Amino acid sequence: EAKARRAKKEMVEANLRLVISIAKKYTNRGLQFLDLIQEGNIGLMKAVDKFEYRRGYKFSTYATWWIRQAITRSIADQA
DNA sequence: TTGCAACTTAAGACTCACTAACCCCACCTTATGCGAATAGTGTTGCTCATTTGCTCAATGATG
């Protein structure tokens, strides 16, 4: 279990540049920036929880959906 | 001679600036879909308190 968590932390630590890169889009919707980066961090955590590698795709395309889920979810109910 | 307290200078952060009044305008938005859950609300059979109209009931005042 601890080994698996080390792997998952390691992957998240890889994909932070992805999450700020997508985080540039929806900035000025009446919320602050680091709220977006943290929500997106949650979203990529969930995307790590739901990714499989034997599918054969690049991780980012699958991850994108969970990130927009977290962002648009968060600004949606935090209007 | 060399460290060391002591004095001197400079750099930087914070606070702070009259009193009252009147008039005007400008103010802050984009996934879909699905099921599950929940809140709401709808219906109904059934209470509980509260005001009036009214009757008994007696007792001294009056015929």
mmCIF file of all heavy atoms in Angstrom, chain B residues 14-30:
data_model
loop_
_atom_site.group_PDB
_atom_site.id
_atom_site.type_symbol
_atom_site.label_atom_id
_atom_site.label_comp_id
_atom_site.label_asym_id
_atom_site.label_seq_id
_atom_site.Cartn_x
_atom_site.Cartn_y
_atom_site.Cartn_z
ATOM 1 P P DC B 14 5.526 47.958 6.708
ATOM 2 O OP1 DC B 14 5.053 46.594 6.989
ATOM 3 O OP2 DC B 14 5.288 48.536 5.375
ATOM 4 O "O5'" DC B 14 4.896 48.932 7.787
ATOM 5 C "C5'" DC B 14 5.753 49.609 8.675
ATOM 6 C "C4'" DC B 14 4.985 50.403 9.691
ATOM 7 O "O4'" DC B 14 5.606 51.692 9.838
ATOM 8 C "C3'" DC B 14 3.579 50.724 9.302
ATOM 9 O "O3'" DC B 14 2.904 51.147 10.440
ATOM 10 C "C2'" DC B 14 3.805 51.878 8.337
ATOM 11 C "C1'" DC B 14 4.924 52.632 9.040
ATOM 12 N N1 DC B 14 5.917 53.275 8.149
ATOM 13 C C2 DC B 14 6.518 54.435 8.581
ATOM 14 O O2 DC B 14 6.173 54.896 9.657
ATOM 15 N N3 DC B 14 7.428 55.032 7.809
ATOM 16 C C4 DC B 14 7.760 54.494 6.653
ATOM 17 N N4 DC B 14 8.665 55.130 5.923
ATOM 18 C C5 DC B 14 7.170 53.290 6.186
ATOM 19 C C6 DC B 14 6.270 52.708 6.970
ATOM 20 P P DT B 15 1.314 51.268 10.423
ATOM 21 O OP1 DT B 15 0.824 50.775 11.721
ATOM 22 O OP2 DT B 15 0.840 50.649 9.173
ATOM 23 O "O5'" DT B 15 1.062 52.836 10.335
ATOM 24 C "C5'" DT B 15 1.968 53.722 10.957
ATOM 25 C "C4'" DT B 15 1.262 54.955 11.453
ATOM 26 O "O4'" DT B 15 2.038 56.112 11.102
ATOM 27 C "C3'" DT B 15 -0.086 55.201 10.831
ATOM 28 O "O3'" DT B 15 -0.829 56.039 11.656
ATOM 29 C "C2'" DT B 15 0.285 55.890 9.526
ATOM 30 C "C1'" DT B 15 1.536 56.676 9.910
ATOM 31 N N1 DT B 15 2.608 56.640 8.881
ATOM 32 C C2 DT B 15 3.604 57.567 8.935
ATOM 33 O O2 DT B 15 3.658 58.426 9.781
ATOM 34 N N3 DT B 15 4.545 57.458 7.965
ATOM 35 C C4 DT B 15 4.587 56.532 6.962
ATOM 36 O O4 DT B 15 5.476 56.514 6.136
ATOM 37 C C5 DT B 15 3.518 55.587 6.954
ATOM 38 C C7 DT B 15 3.464 54.545 5.895
ATOM 39 C C6 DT B 15 2.587 55.682 7.902
ATOM 40 P P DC B 16 -2.392 56.258 11.396
ATOM 41 O OP1 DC B 16 -3.059 56.262 12.701
ATOM 42 O OP2 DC B 16 -2.864 55.375 10.321
ATOM 43 O "O5'" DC B 16 -2.444 57.724 10.837
ATOM 44 C "C5'" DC B 16 -1.529 58.674 11.328
ATOM 45 C "C4'" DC B 16 -1.561 59.903 10.467
ATOM 46 O "O4'" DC B 16 -0.305 60.036 9.782
ATOM 47 C "C3'" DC B 16 -2.591 59.821 9.374
ATOM 48 O "O3'" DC B 16 -3.900 60.209 9.853
ATOM 49 C "C2'" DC B 16 -2.013 60.709 8.276
ATOM 50 C "C1'" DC B 16 -0.507 60.628 8.518
ATOM 51 N N1 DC B 16 0.239 59.842 7.515
ATOM 52 C C2 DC B 16 1.464 60.296 7.099
ATOM 53 O O2 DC B 16 1.884 61.354 7.537
ATOM 54 N N3 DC B 16 2.156 59.589 6.200
ATOM 55 C C4 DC B 16 1.674 58.453 5.742
ATOM 56 N N4 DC B 16 2.403 57.792 4.862
ATOM 57 C C5 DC B 16 0.423 57.951 6.158
ATOM 58 C C6 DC B 16 -0.253 58.670 7.044
ATOM 59 P P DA B 17 -4.355 61.739 10.063
ATOM 60 O OP1 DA B 17 -3.259 62.631 10.461
ATOM 61 O OP2 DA B 17 -5.569 61.720 10.886
ATOM 62 O "O5'" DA B 17 -4.874 62.174 8.643
ATOM 63 C "C5'" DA B 17 -5.472 63.409 8.503
ATOM 64 C "C4'" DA B 17 -4.503 64.408 7.928
ATOM 65 O "O4'" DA B 17 -3.232 63.771 7.716
ATOM 66 C "C3'" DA B 17 -4.893 64.938 6.582
ATOM 67 O "O3'" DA B 17 -5.767 66.006 6.755
ATOM 68 C "C2'" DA B 17 -3.551 65.384 6.023
ATOM 69 C "C1'" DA B 17 -2.604 64.329 6.585
ATOM 70 N N9 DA B 17 -2.299 63.244 5.664
ATOM 71 C C8 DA B 17 -3.075 62.166 5.378
ATOM 72 N N7 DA B 17 -2.529 61.329 4.541
ATOM 73 C C5 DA B 17 -1.316 61.900 4.256
ATOM 74 C C6 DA B 17 -0.271 61.507 3.422
ATOM 75 N N6 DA B 17 -0.303 60.395 2.699
ATOM 76 N N1 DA B 17 0.810 62.296 3.355
ATOM 77 C C2 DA B 17 0.829 63.412 4.077
ATOM 78 N N3 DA B 17 -0.096 63.884 4.904
ATOM 79 C C4 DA B 17 -1.151 63.074 4.946
ATOM 80 P P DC B 18 -7.299 65.851 6.323
ATOM 81 O OP1 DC B 18 -7.651 64.424 6.338
ATOM 82 O OP2 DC B 18 -7.457 66.634 5.094
ATOM 83 O "O5'" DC B 18 -8.104 66.592 7.474
ATOM 84 C "C5'" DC B 18 -7.576 67.755 8.040
ATOM 85 C "C4'" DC B 18 -8.669 68.727 8.412
ATOM 86 O "O4'" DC B 18 -8.591 69.863 7.547
ATOM 87 C "C3'" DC B 18 -10.076 68.235 8.216
ATOM 88 O "O3'" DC B 18 -10.500 67.489 9.328
ATOM 89 C "C2'" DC B 18 -10.841 69.542 8.134
ATOM 90 C "C1'" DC B 18 -9.834 70.516 7.554
ATOM 91 N N1 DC B 18 -10.139 70.942 6.185
ATOM 92 C C2 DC B 18 -11.100 71.923 5.953
ATOM 93 O O2 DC B 18 -11.693 72.427 6.896
ATOM 94 N N3 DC B 18 -11.343 72.310 4.696
ATOM 95 C C4 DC B 18 -10.682 71.750 3.700
ATOM 96 N N4 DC B 18 -10.959 72.157 2.469
ATOM 97 C C5 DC B 18 -9.706 70.750 3.915
ATOM 98 C C6 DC B 18 -9.471 70.382 5.163
ATOM 99 P P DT B 19 -11.712 66.457 9.174
ATOM 100 O OP1 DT B 19 -11.817 65.680 10.432
ATOM 101 O OP2 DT B 19 -11.556 65.750 7.879
ATOM 102 O "O5'" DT B 19 -12.983 67.409 9.077
ATOM 103 C "C5'" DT B 19 -13.417 68.149 10.228
ATOM 104 C "C4'" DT B 19 -14.470 69.159 9.840
ATOM 105 O "O4'" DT B 19 -13.956 70.076 8.855
ATOM 106 C "C3'" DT B 19 -15.706 68.589 9.167
ATOM 107 O "O3'" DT B 19 -16.641 68.001 10.063
ATOM 108 C "C2'" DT B 19 -16.301 69.823 8.523
ATOM 109 C "C1'" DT B 19 -15.067 70.650 8.171
ATOM 110 N N1 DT B 19 -14.777 70.659 6.728
ATOM 111 C C2 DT B 19 -15.470 71.559 5.976
ATOM 112 O O2 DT B 19 -16.253 72.356 6.465
ATOM 113 N N3 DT B 19 -15.203 71.544 4.652
ATOM 114 C C4 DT B 19 -14.343 70.711 4.014
ATOM 115 O O4 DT B 19 -14.206 70.797 2.797
ATOM 116 C C5 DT B 19 -13.662 69.757 4.842
ATOM 117 C C7 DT B 19 -12.699 68.801 4.212
ATOM 118 C C6 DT B 19 -13.922 69.772 6.145
ATOM 119 P P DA B 20 -17.458 66.737 9.572
ATOM 120 O OP1 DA B 20 -18.224 66.217 10.712
ATOM 121 O OP2 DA B 20 -16.528 65.867 8.838
ATOM 122 O "O5'" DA B 20 -18.478 67.345 8.521
ATOM 123 C "C5'" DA B 20 -19.818 67.475 8.874
ATOM 124 C "C4'" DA B 20 -20.439 68.647 8.172
ATOM 125 O "O4'" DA B 20 -19.405 69.509 7.687
ATOM 126 C "C3'" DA B 20 -21.202 68.301 6.934
ATOM 127 O "O3'" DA B 20 -22.470 67.845 7.275
ATOM 128 C "C2'" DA B 20 -21.269 69.654 6.265
ATOM 129 C "C1'" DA B 20 -19.894 70.228 6.582
ATOM 130 N N9 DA B 20 -18.957 70.093 5.483
ATOM 131 C C8 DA B 20 -17.850 69.311 5.436
ATOM 132 N N7 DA B 20 -17.196 69.398 4.313
ATOM 133 C C5 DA B 20 -17.933 70.292 3.575
ATOM 134 C C6 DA B 20 -17.769 70.817 2.293
ATOM 135 N N6 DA B 20 -16.775 70.476 1.491
ATOM 136 N N1 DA B 20 -18.688 71.683 1.850
ATOM 137 C C2 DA B 20 -19.687 72.012 2.655
ATOM 138 N N3 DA B 20 -19.938 71.590 3.881
ATOM 139 C C4 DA B 20 -19.013 70.731 4.285
ATOM 140 P P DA B 21 -23.102 66.597 6.498
ATOM 141 O OP1 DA B 21 -24.233 66.111 7.292
ATOM 142 O OP2 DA B 21 -22.025 65.682 6.118
ATOM 143 O "O5'" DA B 21 -23.661 67.234 5.159
ATOM 144 C "C5'" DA B 21 -24.599 68.248 5.240
ATOM 145 C "C4'" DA B 21 -24.588 69.109 3.999
ATOM 146 O "O4'" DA B 21 -23.262 69.549 3.721
ATOM 147 C "C3'" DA B 21 -24.980 68.412 2.735
ATOM 148 O "O3'" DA B 21 -26.361 68.320 2.660
ATOM 149 C "C2'" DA B 21 -24.446 69.374 1.693
ATOM 150 C "C1'" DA B 21 -23.215 69.962 2.379
ATOM 151 N N9 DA B 21 -21.949 69.543 1.811
ATOM 152 C C8 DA B 21 -20.966 68.855 2.433
ATOM 153 N N7 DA B 21 -19.926 68.635 1.686
ATOM 154 C C5 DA B 21 -20.249 69.230 0.499
ATOM 155 C C6 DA B 21 -19.566 69.348 -0.711
ATOM 156 N N6 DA B 21 -18.356 68.845 -0.918
ATOM 157 N N1 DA B 21 -20.168 70.001 -1.710
ATOM 158 C C2 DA B 21 -21.376 70.507 -1.502
ATOM 159 N N3 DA B 21 -22.116 70.456 -0.409
ATOM 160 C C4 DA B 21 -21.482 69.810 0.564
ATOM 161 P P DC B 22 -27.018 67.010 2.030
ATOM 162 O OP1 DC B 22 -28.370 66.847 2.578
ATOM 163 O OP2 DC B 22 -26.029 65.938 2.168
ATOM 164 O "O5'" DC B 22 -27.155 67.365 0.496
ATOM 165 C "C5'" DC B 22 -27.812 68.541 0.124
ATOM 166 C "C4'" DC B 22 -27.371 68.961 -1.250
ATOM 167 O "O4'" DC B 22 -25.951 69.106 -1.243
ATOM 168 C "C3'" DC B 22 -27.641 67.929 -2.314
ATOM 169 O "O3'" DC B 22 -28.862 68.182 -2.938
ATOM 170 C "C2'" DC B 22 -26.502 68.115 -3.289
ATOM 171 C "C1'" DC B 22 -25.474 68.939 -2.540
ATOM 172 N N1 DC B 22 -24.148 68.309 -2.461
ATOM 173 C C2 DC B 22 -23.309 68.330 -3.558
ATOM 174 O O2 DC B 22 -23.697 68.850 -4.593
ATOM 175 N N3 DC B 22 -22.102 67.758 -3.464
ATOM 176 C C4 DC B 22 -21.720 67.205 -2.330
ATOM 177 N N4 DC B 22 -20.513 66.660 -2.286
ATOM 178 C C5 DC B 22 -22.551 67.182 -1.197
ATOM 179 C C6 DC B 22 -23.748 67.740 -1.308
ATOM 180 P P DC B 23 -29.640 66.986 -3.665
ATOM 181 O OP1 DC B 23 -30.960 67.503 -4.051
ATOM 182 O OP2 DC B 23 -29.537 65.805 -2.797
ATOM 183 O "O5'" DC B 23 -28.806 66.701 -4.998
ATOM 184 C "C5'" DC B 23 -29.070 67.460 -6.159
ATOM 185 C "C4'" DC B 23 -28.047 67.203 -7.247
ATOM 186 O "O4'" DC B 23 -26.729 67.367 -6.719
ATOM 187 C "C3'" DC B 23 -28.029 65.810 -7.808
ATOM 188 O "O3'" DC B 23 -29.017 65.681 -8.800
ATOM 189 C "C2'" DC B 23 -26.641 65.745 -8.422
ATOM 190 C "C1'" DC B 23 -25.828 66.705 -7.571
ATOM 191 N N1 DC B 23 -24.812 66.069 -6.739
ATOM 192 C C2 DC B 23 -23.588 65.749 -7.278
ATOM 193 O O2 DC B 23 -23.394 65.958 -8.461
ATOM 194 N N3 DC B 23 -22.655 65.186 -6.492
ATOM 195 C C4 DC B 23 -22.913 64.968 -5.216
ATOM 196 N N4 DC B 23 -21.958 64.414 -4.470
ATOM 197 C C5 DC B 23 -24.155 65.303 -4.644
ATOM 198 C C6 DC B 23 -25.065 65.847 -5.443
ATOM 199 P P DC B 24 -29.596 64.231 -9.166
ATOM 200 O OP1 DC B 24 -30.818 64.414 -9.962
ATOM 201 O OP2 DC B 24 -29.640 63.460 -7.915
ATOM 202 O "O5'" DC B 24 -28.479 63.578 -10.093
ATOM 203 C "C5'" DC B 24 -28.159 64.163 -11.338
ATOM 204 C "C4'" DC B 24 -26.906 63.541 -11.889
ATOM 205 O "O4'" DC B 24 -25.829 63.780 -10.981
ATOM 206 C "C3'" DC B 24 -26.980 62.047 -11.992
ATOM 207 O "O3'" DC B 24 -27.442 61.694 -13.257
ATOM 208 C "C2'" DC B 24 -25.540 61.593 -11.784
ATOM 209 C "C1'" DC B 24 -24.856 62.791 -11.158
ATOM 210 N N1 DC B 24 -24.236 62.533 -9.856
ATOM 211 C C2 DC B 24 -22.916 62.135 -9.794
ATOM 212 O O2 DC B 24 -22.302 61.957 -10.834
ATOM 213 N N3 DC B 24 -22.349 61.939 -8.596
ATOM 214 C C4 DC B 24 -23.051 62.144 -7.496
ATOM 215 N N4 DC B 24 -22.444 61.936 -6.337
ATOM 216 C C5 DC B 24 -24.402 62.553 -7.536
ATOM 217 C C6 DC B 24 -24.943 62.740 -8.731
ATOM 218 P P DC B 25 -28.180 60.293 -13.475
ATOM 219 O OP1 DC B 25 -28.997 60.413 -14.694
ATOM 220 O OP2 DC B 25 -28.797 59.914 -12.196
ATOM 221 O "O5'" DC B 25 -26.992 59.281 -13.758
ATOM 222 C "C5'" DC B 25 -26.077 59.567 -14.773
ATOM 223 C "C4'" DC B 25 -24.847 58.714 -14.629
ATOM 224 O "O4'" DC B 25 -24.166 59.026 -13.388
ATOM 225 C "C3'" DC B 25 -25.123 57.226 -14.585
ATOM 226 O "O3'" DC B 25 -24.229 56.570 -15.444
ATOM 227 C "C2'" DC B 25 -24.862 56.867 -13.123
ATOM 228 C "C1'" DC B 25 -23.754 57.829 -12.788
ATOM 229 N N1 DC B 25 -23.592 58.075 -11.344
ATOM 230 C C2 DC B 25 -22.341 57.945 -10.739
ATOM 231 O O2 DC B 25 -21.376 57.582 -11.394
ATOM 232 N N3 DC B 25 -22.221 58.188 -9.423
ATOM 233 C C4 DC B 25 -23.272 58.566 -8.728
ATOM 234 N N4 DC B 25 -23.101 58.800 -7.435
ATOM 235 C C5 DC B 25 -24.548 58.717 -9.319
ATOM 236 C C6 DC B 25 -24.660 58.451 -10.616
ATOM 237 P P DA B 26 -24.651 55.195 -16.149
ATOM 238 O OP1 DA B 26 -24.805 55.457 -17.592
ATOM 239 O OP2 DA B 26 -25.767 54.627 -15.374
ATOM 240 O "O5'" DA B 26 -23.386 54.266 -15.919
ATOM 241 C "C5'" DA B 26 -22.384 54.696 -15.040
ATOM 242 C "C4'" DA B 26 -21.533 53.543 -14.592
ATOM 243 O "O4'" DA B 26 -21.166 53.748 -13.211
ATOM 244 C "C3'" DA B 26 -22.227 52.205 -14.605
ATOM 245 O "O3'" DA B 26 -21.261 51.188 -14.626
ATOM 246 C "C2'" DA B 26 -22.935 52.237 -13.271
ATOM 247 C "C1'" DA B 26 -21.836 52.812 -12.405
ATOM 248 N N9 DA B 26 -22.355 53.509 -11.274
ATOM 249 C C8 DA B 26 -23.366 54.401 -11.274
ATOM 250 N N7 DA B 26 -23.637 54.889 -10.105
ATOM 251 C C5 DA B 26 -22.738 54.263 -9.288
ATOM 252 C C6 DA B 26 -22.529 54.324 -7.923
ATOM 253 N N6 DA B 26 -23.230 55.120 -7.129
ATOM 254 N N1 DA B 26 -21.541 53.573 -7.401
ATOM 255 C C2 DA B 26 -20.839 52.792 -8.215
ATOM 256 N N3 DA B 26 -20.969 52.635 -9.524
ATOM 257 C C4 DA B 26 -21.940 53.408 -9.995
ATOM 258 P P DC B 27 -21.486 49.888 -15.532
ATOM 259 O OP1 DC B 27 -20.344 49.803 -16.461
ATOM 260 O OP2 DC B 27 -22.867 49.966 -16.046
ATOM 261 O "O5'" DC B 27 -21.410 48.678 -14.495
ATOM 262 C "C5'" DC B 27 -22.295 48.638 -13.401
ATOM 263 C "C4'" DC B 27 -21.546 48.323 -12.133
ATOM 264 O "O4'" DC B 27 -21.721 49.407 -11.191
ATOM 265 C "C3'" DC B 27 -22.025 47.074 -11.415
ATOM 266 O "O3'" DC B 27 -20.925 46.441 -10.797
ATOM 267 C "C2'" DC B 27 -22.982 47.645 -10.386
ATOM 268 C "C1'" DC B 27 -22.226 48.889 -9.990
ATOM 269 N N1 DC B 27 -23.062 49.897 -9.383
ATOM 270 C C2 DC B 27 -22.965 50.128 -8.023
ATOM 271 O O2 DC B 27 -22.166 49.473 -7.364
ATOM 272 N N3 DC B 27 -23.736 51.065 -7.463
ATOM 273 C C4 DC B 27 -24.588 51.746 -8.209
ATOM 274 N N4 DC B 27 -25.333 52.663 -7.609
ATOM 275 C C5 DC B 27 -24.709 51.525 -9.606
ATOM 276 C C6 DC B 27 -23.929 50.598 -10.146
ATOM 277 P P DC B 28 -19.821 45.700 -11.692
ATOM 278 O OP1 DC B 28 -19.013 44.832 -10.799
ATOM 279 O OP2 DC B 28 -19.148 46.724 -12.530
ATOM 280 O "O5'" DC B 28 -20.688 44.760 -12.644
ATOM 281 C "C5'" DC B 28 -20.047 43.905 -13.618
ATOM 282 C "C4'" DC B 28 -19.953 42.471 -13.142
ATOM 283 O "O4'" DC B 28 -19.830 42.397 -11.700
ATOM 284 C "C3'" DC B 28 -21.138 41.576 -13.515
ATOM 285 O "O3'" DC B 28 -20.669 40.286 -13.934
ATOM 286 C "C2'" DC B 28 -21.926 41.477 -12.221
ATOM 287 C "C1'" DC B 28 -20.834 41.546 -11.167
ATOM 288 N N1 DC B 28 -21.256 42.100 -9.871
ATOM 289 C C2 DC B 28 -22.016 43.274 -9.849
ATOM 290 O O2 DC B 28 -22.317 43.812 -10.924
ATOM 291 N N3 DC B 28 -22.403 43.789 -8.659
ATOM 292 C C4 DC B 28 -22.057 43.177 -7.524
ATOM 293 N N4 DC B 28 -22.461 43.720 -6.374
ATOM 294 C C5 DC B 28 -21.282 41.982 -7.518
ATOM 295 C C6 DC B 28 -20.906 41.484 -8.702
ATOM 296 P P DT B 29 -21.695 39.211 -14.541
ATOM 297 O OP1 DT B 29 -22.525 39.892 -15.566
ATOM 298 O OP2 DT B 29 -22.353 38.514 -13.407
ATOM 299 O "O5'" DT B 29 -20.739 38.171 -15.280
ATOM 300 C "C5'" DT B 29 -21.100 37.603 -16.556
ATOM 301 C "C4'" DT B 29 -20.879 36.107 -16.552
ATOM 302 O "O4'" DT B 29 -21.731 35.504 -15.550
ATOM 303 C "C3'" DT B 29 -21.230 35.403 -17.861
ATOM 304 O "O3'" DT B 29 -20.437 34.222 -18.032
ATOM 305 C "C2'" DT B 29 -22.686 35.028 -17.658
ATOM 306 C "C1'" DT B 29 -22.744 34.719 -16.168
ATOM 307 N N1 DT B 29 -24.028 35.062 -15.533
ATOM 308 C C2 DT B 29 -24.294 34.553 -14.280
ATOM 309 O O2 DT B 29 -23.515 33.833 -13.676
ATOM 310 N N3 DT B 29 -25.510 34.920 -13.756
ATOM 311 C C4 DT B 29 -26.462 35.727 -14.352
ATOM 312 O O4 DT B 29 -27.511 35.972 -13.762
ATOM 313 C C5 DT B 29 -26.117 36.226 -15.667
ATOM 314 C C7 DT B 29 -27.088 37.107 -16.387
ATOM 315 C C6 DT B 29 -24.933 35.872 -16.184
ATOM 316 P P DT B 30 -20.134 33.660 -19.504
ATOM 317 O OP1 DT B 30 -18.786 34.134 -19.907
ATOM 318 O OP2 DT B 30 -21.305 33.964 -20.364
ATOM 319 O "O5'" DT B 30 -20.067 32.081 -19.288
ATOM 320 C "C5'" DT B 30 -20.239 31.170 -20.396
ATOM 321 C "C4'" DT B 30 -20.043 29.739 -19.947
ATOM 322 O "O4'" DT B 30 -20.721 29.532 -18.691
ATOM 323 C "C3'" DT B 30 -20.631 28.690 -20.886
ATOM 324 O "O3'" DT B 30 -19.938 27.441 -20.775
ATOM 325 C "C2'" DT B 30 -22.062 28.554 -20.396
ATOM 326 C "C1'" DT B 30 -22.009 28.975 -18.926
ATOM 327 N N1 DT B 30 -23.011 29.991 -18.561
ATOM 328 C C2 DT B 30 -23.221 30.247 -17.223
ATOM 329 O O2 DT B 30 -22.619 29.671 -16.332
ATOM 330 N N3 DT B 30 -24.170 31.207 -16.966
ATOM 331 C C4 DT B 30 -24.908 31.918 -17.894
ATOM 332 O O4 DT B 30 -25.726 32.752 -17.515
ATOM 333 C C5 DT B 30 -24.634 31.598 -19.279
ATOM 334 C C7 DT B 30 -25.387 32.319 -20.353
ATOM 335 C C6 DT B 30 -23.710 30.663 -19.540
#
